[PDB]
């Protein structure tokens, strides 16, 4: 069941495109593991891409998949271990109708505008809530230093 849907999802993903999710490394061996490249649009992340790995469970789509960031980012919702707390794919908010592209665009929207109400780094969340300027500067520096390069 999981192989049947995931097969059809990638077919349409490569049919249209996303312009914000490039390098769709999907090995046909293990269909339960995708590798992609998030390209944000708004600052302080407009100067770099981020490698991510999405792991789909065996009970997909009846259970949520989970995304881990390969490229480390100075973000209040993403810890330095790579985890991201996305409400769309939480075990309590997950709905089998949620499509993979919706998850990708929700994560991209979380990156473009962080939300310090459900953070993984409380200090970065407080800094984002209070001093937006210094947080944006530090995030731009981190994206330039440790971030990837945007594919064109």
């Amino acid at each position: 069941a999981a192989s049947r849907r995931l097969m059809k999802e990638l077919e349409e993903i490569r049919k249209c495109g996303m312009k914000n999710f490039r390098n769709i490394q999907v090995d046909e061996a293990n269909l339960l593991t995708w590798q992609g490249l998030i390209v944000p649009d708004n600052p302080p992340y407009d100067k770099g891409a981020f490698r991510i790995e999405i792991n789909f469970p065996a009970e997909y789509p009846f259970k949520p998949p989970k995304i881990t960031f390969k490229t480390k980012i100075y973000h209040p919702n993403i810890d330095e271990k790579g985890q991201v707390k996305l409400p769309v794919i939480s075990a309590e908010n997950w709905k089998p109708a949620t499509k993979t592209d919706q998850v990708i665009q929700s994560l991209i929207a979380l990156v473009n505008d962080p939300q310090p109400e459900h953070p993984l780094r409380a200090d970065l969340a407080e800094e984002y809530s209070k001093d937006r300027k210094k947080f944006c500067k530090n995030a731009e520096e981190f994206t330039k230093k440790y971030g990837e390069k945007r594919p064109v």
């Binding site: 009846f62 709905k95 109708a97 949620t98 919706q102």
Partner: peptide, 27 residues
């Protein structure tokens, strides 16, 4: 047939919620 059966299986809540969500709202 099956998708509704699978939603009830992989649900640990005593109230099986509807599995529908799109671009705008969540049922």
């Amino acid at each position: 047939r099956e998708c509704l059966q699978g939603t009830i299986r992989n649900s640990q809540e005593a109230e099986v919620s509807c599995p529908f969500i799109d671009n705008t709202y969540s049922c």
